[PDB]
């Protein structure tokens, strides 16, 4: 699509929403289970992987600047949040609504970026072993990602075709 | 929001580019320090940066708080340097040593220094000022395929409309809280549903605003990104000599202490 | 037998009574089934005050007796729901509230989970969708497929379908064509006649004079004047010293005074203005 | 003469639509220099008029329909050069606020024209001055009232120097305080630039003060008359679904009270004088 404008405003619009949804974790009672993946799934599904990936990187930038993060700024930190909407976009872009698509797309995001890369960026600058930051990661990432597939697939799927047509 | 406030108005806090470069140069200068005079030098400069630029000391706690007990454990882990290699022995080998203590105090000041310089970056600058600086550092890649016109546009709009969509959410939240609604009752199968009553309004709204803005942008004659002036630019003020000196002096002091 | 605020301050942070922040003092009482206008300059705190009614905010000082409950700075979040069936706030631009995939599911949402059954939640949503004047085929018909006007209806029926004792409205008629406001302001004027208090938060002073039994006025979080629309618009200087606007007929009466026609009493309203123009000639 | 002429236009939304045309007929013309009101019930399709004028929206045929904002005809590449003659103020100020600060919103139009910055500084500071926004020049839309963000929305238009200012639904969301203030300003801006204004649907002084009033119910133009003409239209206006301004309402209620006043009073001044007359 050459001459893309008015798709790009809504792009910034979801960059916004995802920046908003990163600060909000609700959550059940004891386990907080943060939001903000929704913004990446949104960047993923209707913008596509190679597009949403560009968004998820800008969603650190805007976020880092406003709330006085952290974030990035520092470059290998945004790659995680850029990667996130990509993989959701990879198999949800111009693709059908199906239960095989999400389970591959939810648990994977954890393993690749949320587990591996987030673990990596923790242990790099310090002497803490990669397997120490891997230890804490496996728990949180064996519990919560199954809570996303419940909200990710169903909530997106309506919104996928509710506003698409 | 989000924070922090530009000065009310305090002295300095000018030209985000130089100060962001000073922020980035300092966290590189936090590394490359091999001595106790190294950590002495980089400590009393970033320090001298703070209260000469005058801020209330209590404002710095907010940045240190979340990482404290983990980083204590880092500095606790490396205060025990013992048996780095060649001892998979012995009994209880790990023990307190000055070598680790000075190592552990290195990591405290090596870590805490990145949360001083960077904290005053956010506190002393508007978010758009940082963005203006960010897009300037971003510029030199114009030589590649990357057009940066739309990258700077998307950033400028999102940074602009993140405040609004926030305030629209609270209004929507209180709206559904009045006719409904309880958000905290326990369940997995249960309360994922509670997201929808805020989300669909927020998404309906965010689409409605992308409509109204894209129309106004074109009725203001937006042909595209190609070649149309700029109103809002950055100067180079007179105060900008201070960070060039502060950065260039500390360089040699750090050079001596490195070697 | 009233809605009573004593002695109610609200601060956004730690505070003491010297500060002017938020709401301050605020001793008043409002009658049973009256139609009460709430007016003031933007940033007086009429918005903040509105949120005290259903306890989205709780005071930092005083007490509030409203639905039979009592809201104190220590009041917890138990039993909020039985208060909000009785006391309903409707925010400006309530067509944003629409979420549900059907008009009738969006209006039922309010009665439902408020302690209505299913039989009486549909009964009420059906009752108040026709009551707020939608065609009945617009039931179903997902509410985002509807005109701007009829979304405002869906929103209203959503908040009125459980029929609260008190209803609070911030600029409900904003952005609607002149015949729309007449319909709306009559539906509330009819809802009042059914024995229910009605709160109205507006900067339009015209329909405050026409539709309201008494008005509250706030300047910088303090309550400056509580009286009926007539007692409020009497003063020329005091009204104008604060930034506050006469209703139109009051300005045309005072405009005839610039020409010197001597209109008897205080018309405030186009029927009352024409009748006292007819009287003042004779 | 006329500053714009719209030919017979049929316009629908065909995606998604066509139970109905939004207009299907129209064919109206605005005289140069004149304040004009387009009034109708929502669904008369007036909301789509102002967008068809600058080319953002288009007729169905493009052939039998002709839209010319005088001097220029819509459109092929014509569109962009038309937008140099005409600009619009929409209803939702927050939604369309394009600037970081006030003076970036008034400079946005100039930016798009490649006007170099030294000249942009002087035009922008002059435009925000003309709307009263001088002191607020560096303030932020978030922190501005609802009538202040339509002063900046209008100030951004004066900087690109339009021939026609179409107020599309502006003052929809606003207090009657700000409404009279905004219109009083546009009235000034109008006669110091000698413009043509197209205002849509506030009734009252927006209509009763306009030089030409077009009643658009429904999809087609119902009469064309001046404000002192069609507001007396009463039933034929009231059965449209519309209402009548104050002086027309006040003279109405006076007639039923036995006071008959001449059907030409467009003002409070005429009515105040007429009651000053009729009191002997």
Residue numbers in the entry:
A (entry chain C): 9 to 173
B (entry chain D): 6 to 264
C (entry chain B): 1 to 282
D (entry chain A): 1 to 280
What does the paper say about this structure?
The other three subunits (EcfA, EcfA′ and EcfT) together form the ECF module that energizes substrate transport by the S-component.
We determined crystal structures of the ECF–FolT2 complex from L. delbrueckii in the apo state (no nucleotides or folate) and in an AMP–PNP-bound state at 3.0 and 3.3 Å resolution, respectively. The FolT2 proteins in the AMP–PNP-bound and apo complexes do not have folate bound. The coupling domains of the two complexes are in identical positions relative to the two ATPases and FolT. In contrast, the transmembrane domains are in different orientations.
